[PDB]
């Protein structure tokens, strides 16, 4: 038995973002006056893209995922032309926005974010869910500034760009790219052309600015190993001395 929702159940507020298949609006559940986000997806568009099978899968997964660092999907409903997703609202915005505003994050903020991401990823893996698109734009912030994964090129691991087969280790690579981008302000393999970025990733060619410390370099270099089996386990990330020295939050 489940709860049935309807459009008339919410007071539509301001638009929060624009999607390639619809828009997201801030909203309030009329009964509880609870603030949430309402993502509207157009079927006609979801159809003309062959991503419907992807949405159905993601919605199934998200509904079952319950973690403080994963954006919550409370439910959904639809009509003749639209699919509505009832999502948790992250009042502090995207990590992407904070990064652009600050240009780069200090070690404390970065290690904290990496810890929250590692926890969320560890939870996902325990549920056989892998390959989360954790780019800054897909990372939101809760009322206390806690990170929330909301993924529902510069970040693809060597195995993927090379058309090879992969596993959960792709998420460890992602974590290394994010740790670097958080500390530096830009992803490690950024280049002028797609072709150049590709060769940069394939060869794991990147440099560290002078302000990136020894501990951060050790963690990033280990996460960004070309060979997936040489990348640390998520528990090793959470126990890394750079993480335990800088994270403002425990695992
Ligand atoms: O789209 C946006 C735009 N940035 C603010 C924001 C959202 C939205 C959202 C982000 C990523 C994926 C799905 C999704 F609905 C959102 C949901 N809760 N808080 C949000 N803030």
């Amino acid at each position: 038995m489940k709860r049935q929702w309807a459009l008339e159940d919410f007071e539509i507020g301001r638009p929060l973002g624009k999607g390639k298949f619809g828009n997201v609006y801030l909203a309030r559940e009329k009964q509880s006056k609870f603030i949430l986000a309402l993502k509207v997806l157009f079927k006609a568009q979801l159809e003309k893209a062959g991503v419907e099978h992807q949405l159905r899968r993601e919605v199934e997964i998200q509904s079952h995922l319950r973690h403080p660092n994963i954006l919550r999907l409370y439910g959904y409903f639809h009509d003749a032309t639209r699919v509505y997703l009832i999502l948790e609202y992250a009042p502090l915005g995207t990590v992407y926005r904070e990064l652009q505003k600050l240009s780069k994050f200090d070690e404390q903020r970065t290690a904290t974010y990496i810890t929250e991401l590692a926890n969320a990823l560890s939870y996902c893996h325990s549920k056989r869910v892998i390959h989360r698109d954790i780019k800054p734009e897909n990372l939101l912030l809760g009322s206390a500034g806690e990170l929330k994964i909301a993924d529902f090129l510069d970040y693809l691991p060597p195995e993927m760009i090379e058309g090879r087969m992969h596993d959960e280790k792709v998420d460890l690579w992602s974590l290394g790219v994010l740790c670097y981008e958080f500390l530096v302000g830009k992803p490690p393999f950024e280049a002028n052309t797609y072709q150049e970025t590709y060769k940069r990733i394939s060869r794991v060619e990147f440099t560290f600015p002078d302000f990136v410390t020894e501990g951060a370099r050790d963690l990033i270099s280990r996460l960004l190993k070309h060979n997936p089996s040489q990348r640390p386990m998520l528990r090793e990330v959470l126990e890394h001395p750079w993480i335990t020295a800088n994270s403002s939050k425990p695992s």
Side-chain angles (χ1 to χ4, degrees), residues 8-225:
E8 51 174 353
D9 293 346
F10 313 79
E11 176 192 63
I12 310 303
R14 69 172 181 283
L16 291 176
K18 167 72 67 178
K20 187 178 182 301
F21 298 118
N23 301 294
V24 184
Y25 301 89
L26 183 59
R28 303 206 320 180
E29 205 295 309
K30 289 183 178 177
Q31 306 180 64
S32 67
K33 295 297 185 303
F34 191 55
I35 309 304
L36 43 72
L38 195 63
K39 184 166 186 183
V40 185
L41 299 163
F42 287 97
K43 296 178 176 177
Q45 301 182 181
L46 294 172
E47 170 271 300
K48 299 264 74 292
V51 295
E52 299 191 307
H53 311 70
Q54 193 185 312
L55 180 64
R56 306 174 191 296
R57 173 189 55 178
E58 300 191 312
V59 175
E60 179 190 308
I61 295 176
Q62 290 291 176
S63 70
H64 290 306
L65 297 177
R66 295 195 181 193
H67 190 283
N69 301 114
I70 298 181
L71 197 71
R72 183 87 196 84
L73 171 61
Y74 298 111
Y76 55 87
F77 58 102
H78 69 299
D79 55 39
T81 66
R82 287 155 293 179
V83 178
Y84 299 91
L85 307 181
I86 310 174
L87 301 159
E88 172 188 357
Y89 170 55
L92 269 51
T94 66
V95 177
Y96 171 80
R97 178 168 67 180
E98 196 94 319
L99 226 201
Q100 305 317 77
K101 185 178 70 172
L102 297 180
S103 75
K104 82 185 179 71
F105 296 154
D106 61 30
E107 300 194 294
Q108 177 173 282
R109 177 180 296 232
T110 297
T112 302
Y113 281 168
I114 293 308
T115 292
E116 303 181 290
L117 280 163
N119 280 160
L121 288 175
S122 184
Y123 169 81
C124 287
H125 293 183
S126 74
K127 281 184 157 53
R128 318 306 290 291
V129 178
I130 66 174
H131 190 49
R132 306 294 306 218
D133 188 325
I134 57 177
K135 53 188 178 181
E137 25 281 292
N138 292 323
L139 304 180
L140 301 173
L141 303 166
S143 62
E146 75 269 26
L147 180 151
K148 307 268 187 181
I149 296 185
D151 61 312
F152 154 67
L153 166 63
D154 280 300
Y155 306 93
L156 300 171
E159 56 262 41
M160 286 188 85
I161 67 173
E162 284 171 40
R164 288 158 48 204
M165 208 159 281
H166 64 285
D167 52 37
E168 81 288 338
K169 288 298 195 172
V170 300
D171 291 317
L172 277 296
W173 170 277
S174 290
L175 197 55
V177 173
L178 269 295
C179 189
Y180 181 105
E181 179 166 16
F182 288 164
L183 290 172
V184 179
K186 290 289 177 185
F189 307 108
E190 191 168 69
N192 295 167
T193 64
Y194 172 80
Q195 310 78 52
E196 284 175 296
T197 298
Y198 179 112
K199 186 175 184 177
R200 292 286 296 290
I201 300 171
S202 178
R203 305 169 60 270
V204 189
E205 163 175 38
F206 68 98
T207 57
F208 288 115
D210 285 303
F211 56 86
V212 179
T213 71
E214 188 181 343
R217 298 182 183 217
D218 182 70
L219 180 58
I220 293 162
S221 288
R222 290 168 61 179
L223 287 167
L224 299 180
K225 280 295 175 186

